[PDB]
Design a protein around this ligand. Sequence first.
Ligand SMILES: O=C1c2ccccc2C(=O)c2c1cccc2-c1cnn(C2CCNCC2)c1
Ligand SMILES: O=C1c2ccccc2C(=O)c2c1cccc2-c1cnn(C2CCNCC2)c1
Lengths: 344, 346
Amino acid sequence: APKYIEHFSKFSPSPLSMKQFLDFGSSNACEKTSFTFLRQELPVRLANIMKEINLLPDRVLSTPSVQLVQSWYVQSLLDIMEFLDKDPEDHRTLSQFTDALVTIRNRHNDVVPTMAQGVLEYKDTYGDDPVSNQNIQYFLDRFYLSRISIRMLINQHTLIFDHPKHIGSIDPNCNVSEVVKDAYDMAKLLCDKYYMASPDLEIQEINAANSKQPIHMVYVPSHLYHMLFELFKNAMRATVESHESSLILPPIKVMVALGEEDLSIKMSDRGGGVPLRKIERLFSYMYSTAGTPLAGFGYGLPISRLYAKYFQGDLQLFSMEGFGTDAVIYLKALSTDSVERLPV
Amino acid sequence: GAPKYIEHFSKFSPSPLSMKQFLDFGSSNACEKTSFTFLRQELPVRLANIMKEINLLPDRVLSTPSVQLVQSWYVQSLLDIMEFLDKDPEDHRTLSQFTDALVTIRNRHNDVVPTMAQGVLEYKDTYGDDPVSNQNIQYFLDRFYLSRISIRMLINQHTLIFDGHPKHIGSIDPNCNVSEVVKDAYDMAKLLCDKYYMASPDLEIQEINAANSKQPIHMVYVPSHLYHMLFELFKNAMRATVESHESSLILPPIKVMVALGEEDLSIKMSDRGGGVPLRKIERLFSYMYSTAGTPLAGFGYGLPISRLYAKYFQGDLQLFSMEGFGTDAVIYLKALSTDSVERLPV
Ligand SMILES: O=C1c2ccccc2C(=O)c2c1cccc2-c1cnn(C2CCNCC2)c1
Ligand SMILES: O=C1c2ccccc2C(=O)c2c1cccc2-c1cnn(C2CCNCC2)c1
């Protein structure tokens, strides 16, 4: 296993473009090609994340939760190693490979909260929240983004080779407003259940080049949903908790803008805002302004920002203390600008 | 005599002053002899530290005629203040000579910003060089121009208080009505916009005083600093708005929100000038980068200098755009005088 990790960590993960994802999940989709690609690329990506995990201080690495996560990565690498000698022409190989990728995806379902638990186990033993937080911040960004990239490759294979007009998890005609409404509907269910009130949603679209046209892009809807759902939970909590005695809640306003290069989604709340001093902290792992279902374990904003960065986007927060907050997701408008951002 | 004076005074660190200290020392109890004995130590300390900052430039930028000229001004200004070290504070003519000397220094340095910019262009005309030295230049110029804002603030306080509108403590308005400064900046930008384009967007101002909803928003601030930032942001918003609506009879207005929270006084300026792609935002804050003769465009110094004015009393200035719609520029100031302290580079 240390042998496999050293061999595969000699290679660099290969960033894939949206055009490649669409081409390889198209009419010409060949399962044998996907198999011979992934039995090289997934060990490369697994070995590079296992190297990233070994760049943690020995005291974080020795926590039971981090050792558990490490044991999963080892097991997953060994599962794929079983396929290196197997024959792509044999339909049993291809079927076993798909089953193995489903097993790996399922084994890693709770990586995010488990890795979070290891960071808390480090505090329960050393009793300290000092300047090693910048090192952990840096590592967890790289770790969780690498993981988004591995699950993207596994989802593409299992969806294609095991709505219906998608290419695996990609919707080439992703209606951005529809995903906004879906995220809002699900946040609103949680908000209504706990607070018995929720703000309304207003959506405005600005299609600069085509004023009357609904805004569509090539994107992974589940990634956009994740970001917007996390931002809606924040905007709805801020709005209801700042208007605890009001019959009238100010609405959440979403603008979807399509320019030449950027598709921008701004979510504006009137939840009372945050002082500028507190913004950088909101993007820290496990920092929380907060049981309300609208509050998590402080992972919503930093993970959501990784989803945005993954296809060359970004996620920014700008607040005005005493009024409210704007959260902006920046995506690449063009499929030809949309390439995996993999930690280097 | 000069490299000796610079070494002696650079042993000291500039002392950050708070809004309470500025108000107290320009108050009822204002003593000119106290201001003199303070500034004849603090100004040489600040001059020596900026002259050290200038010597941290690569030899090729430092040897340009424009940078050598700026260096010669700082040297002459340090020597002018050195003449006062032995002079008697009890002699009222010492104090009058000191004020005259500070006016001379302020006037001598009036063109520092564009002269320093010329030295950066002289460096390109000789090397060609626009590569990876730009981050070093950016880093140095931020520290240089902010140190200069701080020296001019001290000189302006002394000459406005002790040389002789009327409720001000030197350049500080303890009851600075933020909306009034917004209107002043807008009126002046609008004159330039009308003169060149023969059209200008209207202004809408909304105030949100979270703790006191019906109260006008006031703070302790230096109006001329707030004016500078808002005037530069209005020029940008007006240019973007008119140049994206070159065939329209109707221009969308510029909207300003002034919000007062417990800790922050935030001023957002929102235009519908078509916005900028996210890739281009970082370079708007770069010295001498220009999206651009129109008086609404400069030599690419508006945003980075404006951000230094915001940083100087522990604020900030941020830009966020939506390509195809428009741009929000936010000035963040400290609401409370007790949080308002000089940010000095050492
Ligand atoms: O299933 C595949 C696939 C699935 C989903 C997205 C992308 C791909 C994909 O890219 C791929 C696949 C199978 C076989 C070969 C490739 C391939 C093409 N170019 N490369 C380059 C990497 C960087 N430069 C050197 C070669 C690898
Ligand atoms: O004219 C003055 C003045 C004018 C405008 C603003 C501020 C001041 C000012 O503060 C000052 C002045 C004259 C004499 C002394 C002081 C003073 C007070 N404390 N300190 C130092 C204490 C230890 N290190 C940090 C600062 C210096």
